[model samples]
Target chain A: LDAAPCEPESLEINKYFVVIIYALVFLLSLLGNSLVMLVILYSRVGRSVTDVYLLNLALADLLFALTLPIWAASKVNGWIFGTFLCKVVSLLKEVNFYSGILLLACISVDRYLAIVHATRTLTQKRYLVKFICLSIWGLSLLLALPVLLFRRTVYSSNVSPACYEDMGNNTANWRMLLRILPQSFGFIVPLLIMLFCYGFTLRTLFKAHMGQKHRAMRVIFAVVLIFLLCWLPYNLVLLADTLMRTQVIQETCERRNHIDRALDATEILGILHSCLNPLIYAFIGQKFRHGLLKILA
Target chain B: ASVATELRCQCLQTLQGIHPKNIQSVNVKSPGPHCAQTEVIATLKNGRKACLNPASPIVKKIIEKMLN
Candidate 1:
């Protein structure tokens, strides 16, 4: 077999570092997203469509945060939580990623309509937004079902039992197929929508001075930017790994090792995103700050 | 709608020692959406099919000869 003759062994130091970072991210995500949910819930009056999406975004992050401690412990101890927890945690992570971007894409279009066309009818409809949010959740879950189906706790004599996708002998082919399909529909399409919507929305904002719309866009832009900054590297690395596995790029053992390390490092960066949106809201959203202040007072 | 199912690369391990004359046919498949790398599947006169490493010099020579 053209297998990479040896599996790359991760450094013990790297494992501990990952655990520490995961712990930090867990604590921060829990604290930050809880506050976001509280603030959004407390400010019930005059809550915009964006507020609803933001609340759901916070909810996704909050749910994802609860899984981080399990993931953190598993980083060093391996998958001690068994197959059920593995699948459930993986589902949460997948759903969070898909829903987060899809919600952002929705916000982008919402902004696009609100500013570019000055349309109040669609964006002002609270019931429609709730329906859209429900649809996004459903689509995210559907996209993530593969994880639930394939993910399991796999035991090996050489290393600790780990949680991973098992697709039998043709695992490589299946994994590539799985990654390409879901990613195209879930991440790439949504990203394109966001880009297109935001492009027009930005042009409109710049063409005419609109202080209120501009202020509203600040948090959305920062959140999207932060998400891309955190996750893009991981996606790029995953692409590289896919190429290497399929031997599009010459799969040397050294290159394999390098990609493996890069994946781990970049994934941690992506996980760090869960806690960051609340910070962005605190810094950029005047209403969020006032709401938090009111809650404290 | 008929969906296209792509199969993985066929070679688990490539054959190394088979003589050239025994090869009845050499089918060279270029990389595509289905498979990521070039595949050289050789059909021997004995009716057994074997995969040869495309990067191997011998396989390259065989392909060049077939091309000419």
Candidate 2:
């Protein structure tokens, strides 16, 4: 049923690097997302559909940021927080992964309608935006239920208390079903939606030509591009790892180690992405600075 | 304090699953230097070991129902 067991040493080599990476991500995400929240909440800028989504996105990142110190410490010292924190933190991480992507998908759809169809329905019914956000959060939690159900701290004589998913009995079958289902629903579906909406959204912008274009549209495209750049590789690697685990791909130790390395590296890239949104916001958002300045001054 | 004790006992029974009668004892175990999370180790009457999450209510409920 298995071929290549992941090399313990491979991830071990990168442990310090991973810790520093998470620390940097935590700080940057904290600063960036805080500003994003402050600007959106306290500023005079009329909250658009995109802004609402971004606000939630920032929040998801912020919540995840709160969990990072624990994760960082665990990387160095292993999970010392005991069983309850293990479940709670893992659940938060899973929820953030799902909701972050879902919120971005929502933004892409909103942008597509506003730009391509010139739809004013979203702006007209401001109250509905709250409902949409709630549904996104609910759906994310539903997708993340398996994490809460199966995640536990495992004690092994050779290893520190490692927080991991425990798929009781028939582990391979449950692992495959759990990983594939959520990856598809949580990541692949949202990616498709983003591509579809952004594809048309970009097309419309290009055709409209000259001075009539909204500069903010360019910013959305960048956000989508940066997101895919950071997250796409990780998802693909997870998919490959899953295929191998379920023996869809010929299992070999070499392939297993290769995928393990890829997962470890790309997962860091995904975490780093949390900080990137704020950088994009500061760089491209015109009103964001104005709001920030207004608050500070 | 009472609630915490009750919760802990309920969690133990829950992990016992379908046979609280079979559980000899349940204890929290720490992993070695390489592991990052703690485990709830349940020793059955027959001396088999089952690992369960101490924090999961659903896992507890399923186990409780099994005992009845």
Candidate 3:
């Protein structure tokens, strides 16, 4: 009953553009995240709670970057890598996204405690930090289990086989449910926590005017800011897409095509974030650069 | 009794197998402020109304046939 014969034309140029962007991000993220991990790992002295979170963030980006070339190839030639890779790569992407935000949320809380409450004991416990990082990865995997379950290689007429979620029969409801539930718990909740924690932390920072504390917060703030800049548009576009699909907004062919194009463009923006945090650390964090310089020397 | 505006999508579940001969009328409602899903309400000849899944292949066929 909802079928429309009007097929929106896809830009042929966009396909190659996706390939190029993915390739570039893949290369840069590999180099940058490796340096981030090496620098953090080498500098054992004065490793703060933020350093642990940064290490995990770099690891997530590195793992996610490893999957980008596969996606680039699949974008051009379709899913020739078969079912196992389809599920694994999709899982990695979902886990990476969820873990990154969750880690940022944790960092905000750590900062909140360190500055706002002026508590050093909790932040000093490396064992608890390790446990928290482990829990974040576990939660990320759990949140991303839907992709592992539903993602598979789909073969259809004329087109090359594609990797897609195959929710049988009532695809609309299933998809909406899948997106809304995980996204609310994983992305929305963690984002709100970051906002709440950062709000108080900033207030405390302004009152104290501590130079060292300000320096420590700068890299984290930059990372969070970069993350929001890169990902918020994609999520907003996704929300619009969901609204149109669910019929809250009238679905016109033109609006549909516009949203589709926006999704593709914004997703590439989100993917661009994998290479950005390491750059942020290099430029914004003095210790990160000092550690790198020491290693080079 | 006055008819109230639907606050949400009416078709939580949809029927797929009702024969066209028994359907008295098929009403197609575009998504509006009250509901976000495109709804297809089928009035049966036996004084009954059923909601059809818009994405169902058979329902699409029925709708297309009705239009023709």
Candidate 4:
């Protein structure tokens, strides 16, 4: 409140109510995703490479739910955590994001191999597929590390704390790179791979092979559809706003605030990911359902 | 103490955001005897609607002083 210069425009939002929603969603999602992970780990039913990735995906979602309590607390009160923890918060957010995108991409590729060219890829690529899954997890974390490294928790003169990086002054410019890399590599890249992998997987499922592809195609179609609907707006908007900012086409805090709000709503998709992925596995993966039911029971 | 209805107050609030500075702060008598989409409006001090009217004799006589 000292040396106040630019007053923030007051928004007519019930933020406490919203934080309560975040808390409820976080607790529920964490419990649900944990149950999923337990079922995958101990139960012998869902023991496919696909199940491995899905289980890890659930873990990632659970971690994100843990971070939500921090955010909800901050929203209701003030950002009590210093700049370092704020960066970590933002990093966890990206890890949730990148982990899911890569996991879905893995599933799509797995479906294509299982359906389209099963004989060629199934035996030859099976072990390699395991390694690829590991690599995806490793690389996703590697890519997301900069979000941890570069992001800072900034506090204003009034102690209005925000978890953000001033990318403009970074010695290594890690923040700017992390900011755009997810949209490009995590979203767009995976989306392109999904389009090709699933489009033809769908075509081969219905038109050509009827037996094996039926369930797999259903999975690919559903997951890809949900993934697209979940992620497209954010990647597109972030890219657009970034371009506007970088190109000097327009630079205003007001416009950025609107875009940031739109991005905030997409975290709803991240929650939806917690719900949808398990739903897809339970329905699509035969071994998964029994495994979960037994574990739950 | 003009009891402008809620619908009438909206006409005034429409002026607060978009209207010129001198207009009446918009308010209307809302429903339930009190509630409406009401907003505070700022108006010229010491000038009643009649005194500030363009065609008022007092306005014409005081126009030079007022403008100054």
Candidate 5:
């Protein structure tokens, strides 16, 4: 039986427009992360490897935030900046997201090993944190390479130039992969690693006196919560989109409104990730809170 | 790395749903409204397609090619 393709739902204008959130998230994230970066950069604390990863995370958040207005503009007027902006923005967005996820994972692992294993070995190897940060950047560049290869300024039938996948009838195999890979790489895996690390970290901490492991526990809780709150909606939307593509849920396939809104929400969440981190840094990050304040004076 | 790999594979399989048989050992890319450009190329034969310019020269190839 033939069925008509459902029309894409008209998104009712919400005060919670993704672009506005992206702007708020961007400014706040920058302010928040700048504080964190300053604290770490100039702190008197003779620190551990954890400091390096948080620094990397803060840096990643700020860099990602820098792209927000470009994206927000695209949301308002489509991507009018031409092919260069499309490709460059796509590459930076992927790199920033993937790097943040890896840094979050690294942070979790660092805490997990420190608490569960409780060996002084982690503390001894502070220099290697630099190498790990470098590798995260390198790996992010490699994984995000496809955005450069695949992204271009695409004009819709409506004559709108969008910095998005061609979405033409003939969109390439590689193009589809572009959509799935970045979302999964930059969000899902990091979430899983965070979950695993937190699970074991909690068990390890429960065994010890609560007061002794309190600070570390606080950090872990904050990171996991922040990562999840920033990324969970996007993860579900992408995952659901994948499921629809594979015919796993053909039943839900015809209901375009639910799926379309969900996917849009994911896009918003992706932008929000950049914005959310600054707030996360300001509150959860001990170093950022104090150090950034000095910069204001 | 791992989740991206899995998702990439999953997406690849999803694209496998759309197959164009003449596409034998091809270079696929983004301008993509044709099979390699847009239609899924199912290369029936494997060959090293060279210079493999990902960018389309359709605009410059102009006069008659446009009408064709």
Candidate 6:
């Protein structure tokens, strides 16, 4: 089994097509994330724990949206942004991923307490939520530290420069270890927390008056489900990718290329989340609309 | 356009025994009229010929390096 029977095929995605996709995503996400930020941050909305977390979620997405065009451009033209910009952009991407999931996890826990327990604990400890959010940002930044440290602007002889990690001789090991840490803390752990909290939260809602309780939990349910929908496949693909890289699964060129394509497509889907969450807010949360239209009106 | 002969084999095997990472440079040519979607003619720095998957990161890297 050491020899490959057939050579793995490289996916032939056109750079122009990829650029177009990212461009559209960038425009839509910018509009959505900005509207969310404007409503939550600027519309004199009373600062509740839920409001605060929502603001951070929009902020993470908005910041991430800013990077999309650069990436789109790089897809066609290479990393012409130079070394400093390369590291910063990659770090921003990492921070965005870490923060987006972390914020959603916090939102799930808040929803669980508010709806399932029917407690004013979160609202009363609004100040604590602020501190907790600060801690989330701190932890996310720490998790993304390696990207800042290792992402280098690489020059190949024939193409434009690429921003890649040059982790030296043990690159595979280093990349695997670095990736696993963030994927666990940034995605899997948070996903588990959301699942557990939502499981109980949904069960509690089911036993309550179906009509009223459903309305109350709808936004939260949608938020969790949508987050998972957008990101779960990406993370699973990444997990398989990590496993394959670590040689837990035998690496064949075909399998590797398949995973690579999966990662690319699903990662784009995940990036679409930055824009999608705001749509959830606008559609599901009644107060969000009033605030959004308040600005327009 | 330089026409390379039609070659429809796995680029990796064509490049067998050569380390893609260590490759200093390469030239990607069209795999002629009869080649598959993924096939491309890669002329390596050592003057060896291989039908390479031009989209592979290593090949891209080599091309990138060669550009500079």
> Highest DockQ: which candidate?
5
Per-residue C-alpha lDDT of model 1 across residues A50-108, encoded as one tens digit per residue? 78878898888788778888877776867778889889889998888788768777867
Instruction: Supply fnat for every model shown.
Output: 0.00, 0.00, 0.00, 0.00, 0.15, 0.04
Worst lDDT run of 10 residues, candidate 2 chain A, spans A1-10
Candidate 2 docks at the CAPRI level of incorrect
- Tens digit of per-residue lDDT, candidate 5, span A241-284: 66765558763324434665566666666566655665654455
Give model 1's DockQ, 2 decimals: 0.03
Q: Tell me model 3's lDDT, rounded to 2 decimals.
A: 0.74
- Candidates sorted on DockQ, descending: 5, 6, 3, 1, 2, 4
Model 2 stretches with alpha carbons more than 4 Å out: A1-7, A10-12, A119-127, A212-220, A281-283, B1-68
Per-residue lDDT for A130-229 in model 2, tens only?
7899998998899888878886775544345667666654444555677775678767898899889888888878788668477756776787789788
lDDT (Cα, tens digit) per residue for candidate 1, span B1-68: 10111123444466553577777887776663334567677777876777788788777888676677
lDDT of each: 0.73, 0.68, 0.74, 0.58, 0.61, 0.69
- For model 6 chain B, give the 10-residue run with minimal summed lDDT: B1-10
Per-model chain A TM: 0.90, 0.89, 0.90, 0.82, 0.84, 0.88
- How much RMSD separates candidate 6 from the native structure? 9.0
Question: Is 5 or 6 the stronger prediction by DockQ?
Answer: 5
Cα RMSD to native, each candidate? 9.7, 11.4, 9.3, 12.7, 10.6, 9.0
Tell me which of candidates 4 and 5 scores higher on DockQ.
5
Candidate 6, residues A1-297: lDDT per residue as tens digits? 132224334323555677889999999988887777777777564766678888888898889899898887876767778889989898898898788888888887876777766765654543478888999999989988888888777554323466776566455456667777767897779989998988898788888766777676776677777878887898788789767655699866667557756766787788788778777754467788877777787
Q: What share of the true interface contacts does candidate 6 keep?
A: 0.04
**Deviating ranges (above 4 Å) for candidate 6:** A1-13, A119-127, A157-160, B1-68
Which of the two, 4 or 5, has more lDDT? 5
After the best TM-score superposition of candidate 3, give how far the Cα of residue A136 lies from its true spot, in angstroms.
0.5
Residue A109, model 3, lDDT: 81
Best model number under lDDT: 3
Rank list by lDDT: 3, 1, 6, 2, 5, 4
